[PDB]
């Protein structure tokens with residue numbers, strides 16, 4: 312009934328707030344928008360960054376660090392989705408493994424506008440053109456920027472995004488899953504809760520449910536495109552015995 | 562009004578029939594060995610291939626059929642209300658990015674786990690036979706079978722597919738589009754039409770609408786993979802001619 316759907320929605324919203332550092336609502340206030348309580352430090356050039364083992368590699372590695380960190384926040388959020396911990400533990404691991412990249416790029420949009428991205432929990436702001444100003448690394452944020460511009464045109468808020476992220480985790484078509492049935496049964500429930508949420512939250516945005524789902528197609532293409540860049544960078548340099556243990560962590 | 566959505570659904574179903582020679586309904590009647598009205602001849606090896614008469618031959622068959630399919634899809638496209646009224650450059654762009662996604666959607670209608678109908682249903686070519694084709698060509702069809710088997714478990718019929726196919730063409734998040742808003746206004750209507758159609762045609766089937774739209778992710782991947790395998794073929798087969806139309810669509 313509408314009752315357990317709204318219950319599910321509020322549950323997810325509550326744990327999404329608890330699990331992640333900067334909400335979209337706060338990121339929007341910082342960006343383009345209102346509140347400049349404390350302006351973020353802006354990174355627009357090589358100087359700016361320093362004023363903030365090596366620049367272009369420094370920045371791409373920094374994004375990896377945050378993303379490893381984010382995997383744990385996503386994990387904790389996953390385990391708050393009703394039914395998730397009851398799944399086969401191999402399937403939990405699989406769902407997280409193939410889901411975290413799509414989740415990261417989804418949420419990255421919350422931190423982006425067409426001009427740049429908030430980092431360090433909104434304390435910083437790296438400009439889009441400074442990012443594109445790199446060498447075989449000026450290639451890696453631009454498709455995220457192009458995706459975010461289109462995705463943010465849907466004007467979702469955190470309550471919408473909480474359910475959407477849960478939908479992504481409970482996919483069903485991840486390779487190697489052992490028991491697809493309960494996963495799809497949970498996702499069917501989450502899709503219902505999502506549909507309702509979007510109808511109550513955006514009553515005059517017609518077919519917002521459908522439009523948001525079609526965005527999954529662009530999301531997977533981003534992820535695919537990102538892993539192939541990663542494979543190229545794994546041909547920039549791999550041999551060095553000065554962070555073997557840090558290499559491990561990533 | 563739901564009434565307007567029903568008329569649009571009827572209209573699109575109607576054009577689909579008139580545009581596409583072999584419907585899913587006919588494909589299923591052929592495939593199910595309980596209607597012996599006219600059974601297909603089955604191609605499962607090279608001698609049955611020669612009885613029912615290599616890899617290049619088969620794939621250029623596929624190439625010619627695809628170009629004709631583009632024609633039929635193009636014909637169907639003009640019947641979608643609002644489509645011919647769009648900026649022409651966008652009409653080209655919509656077709657360019659839509660055509661292959663639709664071909665693999667419809668291809669599934671002619672497939673089961675064991676093979677695919679060919680030559681307007683007169684032939685059936687085995688999945689194993691296609692998989693054993695020489696090294697580059699043996700990998701072309703297998704991901705389409707994979708898609709088709711899970712897509713076919715949605716159990717869509719032609720009146721469903723007519724609207725879904727229209728939804729695909731009228732995307733708008735396609736690259737290079739000049740006027741996105743009028744494209745999205747039309748898709749928005751196709752989507753309402755699709756949503757109603759599935760809930761009436763499949764009352765017991767929970768969130769079929771969402772699960773169908775998720776399938777759009779899979780069609781993208783198929784196209785992407787097929788493209789990268791075509792550029793392999795282009796280099797190992799310098800003597801094989803890719804069709805100019807198909808060439809213009811791929812970039």
Ligand SMILES: CC(C)(Oc1ccc(-c2cccc3ccccc23)cc1)C(=O)O
Pocket residue numbers: 331333370373374377378381415416418419420422428429430431437452
């Ligand atoms: C889950 C998410 C979106 O994870 C992020 C991952 C990477 C970045 C990021 C993106 C681009 C450059 C960066 C440089 C240093 C640190 C982080 C980045 C921002 C957020 C977040 O922090 O909300």
Ligand SMILES: CC(C)(Oc1ccc(-c2cccc3ccccc23)cc1)C(=O)O
Pocket residue numbers: 583619622623626627630663664665667668669671677678679680702
């Ligand atoms: C739109 C569609 C799906 O177009 C087709 C495209 C390719 C094939 C096909 C697929 C695989 C092998 C073939 C060999 C000879 C001729 C055609 C094929 C069948 C149909 C159709 O005819 O319904």
